[PDB]
Design a protein around this ligand. Structure first.
Ligand SMILES: COc1c(-c2nc3cc(NS(C)(=O)=O)ccc3o2)cc(-c2ccc[nH]c2=O)cc1C(C)(C)C
Length: 557
């Protein structure tokens, strides 16, 4: 029952890979300790292969089957539609990996006869054959981090024609089923502001609250054949078109359960018997399985009044405390149950008695004050990885602009406002690229966003207070200041000096640029302008921004 078997063939790159931080004329204005920033490359794929390869044993008890029966009762209320080839084509990212069969992502998006004809033949083969393993490509991800070096994470994905078929069969399922099955526990239905609100209300709902985050070691590799067949039985509870039922059974048998792994040079690398990290069902499958195992583990541990918050492989549990020592024993029982379910831990879970000390989705709740002096809870994170990635993005154009995603998701934070906004608006002004749409990812889905639209996006997700927050916590200020000294980033007083210049330069341009100056940088002036709702914000189609998670799902919105 191994997660993977290997031939010895290498996981090969597609292009030239850079590991050392690229340096340009802008680099030093952001970060001086260049040797601390690195990117992962295929050179470390061999080490990751060793980490992800292990035997999985599963012991399933009555708590497991009880929770599964409850989940299936809710899943039976879902009605899902089959997307047309055209609808599925339009969900494809413009820079999605080209097919092996003579067409790419732009051919798909343009509904080219060749792409559409190949997608129809892949679909027909899914209906007619429910046995043949489907080919997948295995790649090493190129991701940026700060030292203290991680080996490259791996991505496993089927061909472009298969990905369009996955959308046709399961896009509606993976978008609507998780919230129906898990209700308020489904994390991807919330904006960061709604996630904060859910965490605070849950913490308050408990007489003596205790909370913990549970880190499953290499989650995708812990997902067994049973787990993948169980996820399929959940999808099959939906009211579905006969062709969708057949395609879902086919995709589960031929792709989701496992299959051969091919490198970028066409060599057989081995065989996968665990979750594929680059399929449409990665996020939904991970969320459902994590929620199932954790809800059953909570019953086995006799945890009282358990509220879960699940996002793929990320899990937060808030419950009633039995006192510090009993909570510690309780958590070891929870961990034993998770382990029997084939979800052992990385770091052992730690009981927390302060909401602000729980780290989940690399984030924590913190408090600041709005213009009226009222306490405001918001989500923040250690800014090390956002800052290492901003330094890379200062000297290189990348497919996903992490700085833009981070300003969107962490707009109320002291570090996104003072550093990211200041640095990148300065760069965009110098290149007159404020109107240029840039790609970013929100809950794994790809978006093409113009930086000029940031005031309206921030207002809609976080409210006007995101432009007024002040009197940040001593703990939060200390973590930001320590991160700056560690990376060789100029102190906050420098960013404030720079922001006044960036603000003045934006206001000069007028129009949408002046709105960016006015709203994004009001924190930088001593005589603060009165901020009122932006008329353009109501018009924004913020559609399925926070409906579901799509990590590795090849989704463009
Ligand atoms: C929900 O938490 C997130 C997530 C997020 N996506 C996750 C996906 C997984 N697992 S998987 C691969 O199986 O799907 C686990 C934890 C995750 O956290 C992403 C961003 C995020 C941050 C910056 C840019 N784009 C983003 O999507 C921001 C938040 C916050 C701010 C709400 C905490």
């Amino acid at each position: 029952h191994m997660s993977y078997t290997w031939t010895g063939a290498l996981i090969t790159p597609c292009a030239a890979e850079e590991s050392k931080l690229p340096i340009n004329a802008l680099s030093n204005s952001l970060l001086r300790h260049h040797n601390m920033v690195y990117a992962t490359t295929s050179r470390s794929a061999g080490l990751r292969q060793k980490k992800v390869t292990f035997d999985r044993l599963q012991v399933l008890d009555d708590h497991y089957r009880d929770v599964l029966k409850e989940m299936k009762a809710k899943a039976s209320t879902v009605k899902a539609k089959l997307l047309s080839v055209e609808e599925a084509c339009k969900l494809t990212p413009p820079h999605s990996a080209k097919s092996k069969f003579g067409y790419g992502a732009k051919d798909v998006r343009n509904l080219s006869s060749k792409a559409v004809n190949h997608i129809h033949s892949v679909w027909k083969d899914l209906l007619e054959d429910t046995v043949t393993p489907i080919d997948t490509t295995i790649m090493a991800k190129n991701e940026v981090f700060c030292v203290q070096r991680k080996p490259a994470r791996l991505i496993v994905f089927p061909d472009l024609g298969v990905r369009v078929c996955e959308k046709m069969a399961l896009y509606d399922v993976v978008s609507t089923l998780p919230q129906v099955v898990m209700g308020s526990s489904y994390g991807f239905q919330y904006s960061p502001g709604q996630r904060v609100e859910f965490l605070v209300n849950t913490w308050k709902s408990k007489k003596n609250p205790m909370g913990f985050s549970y880190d499953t070691r290499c989650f995708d590799s812990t997902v067994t054949e049973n787990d993948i067949r169980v996820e399929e039985s959940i999808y099959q509870c939906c009211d579905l078109a006969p062709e969708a039922r057949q395609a879902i059974k086919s995709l589960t048998e031929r792709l989701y359960i496992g299959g051969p792994l091919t490198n970028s040079k066409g060599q057989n690398c081995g065989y996968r018997r665990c979750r594929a990290s680059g399929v449409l069902t990665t996020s939904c499958g991970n969320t459902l399985t994590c929620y199932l195992k954790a809800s059953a583990a909570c019953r086995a541990a006799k945890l009282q009044d358990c509220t879960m918050l699940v996002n793929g492989d990320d899990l937060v549990v808030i419950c009633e405390s039995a006192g510090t020592q009993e909570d510690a024993a309780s958590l070891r029982v929870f961990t034993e149950a998770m382990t029997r379910y084939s979800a052992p831990p990385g770091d052992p879970p730690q009981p927390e008695y302060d909401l602000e000390l729980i780290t989940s989705c690399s984030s924590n709740v913190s408090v600041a004050h709005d213009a009226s002096g009222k306490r405001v809870y918001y989500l923040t994170r250690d800014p090390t990885t956002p800052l290492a990635r901003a330094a890379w993005e200062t000297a290189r154009h990348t497919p996903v602009n992490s700085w833009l995603g981070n300003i969107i998701m962490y707009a109320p934070t002291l570090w996104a406002r003072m550093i990211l906004m200041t640095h990148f608006f300065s760069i965009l002004l110098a290149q007159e690229q404020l109107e240029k749409a840039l790609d970013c990812q929100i809950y794994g889905a790809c978006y093409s966003i113009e930086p000029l639209d940031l005031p309206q996006i921030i207002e809609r997700l976080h409210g006007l207070s995101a432009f007024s927050l002040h009197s940040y916590s001593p703990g939060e200020i200390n973590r930001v200041a320590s991160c700056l000294r560690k990376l060789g980033v100029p102190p906050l007083r420098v960013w404030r000096h720079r922001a006044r210049s960036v603000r003045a330069r934006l206001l000069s341009q007028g129009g949408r640029a002046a709105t960016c100056g006015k709203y994004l940088f009001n924190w930088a002036v001593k005589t603060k302008l009165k901020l009122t709702p932006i008329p353009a914000a109501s018009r924004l189609d913020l559609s399925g921004w926070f409906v579901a998670g799509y990590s590795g799902g090849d989704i463009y919105h």
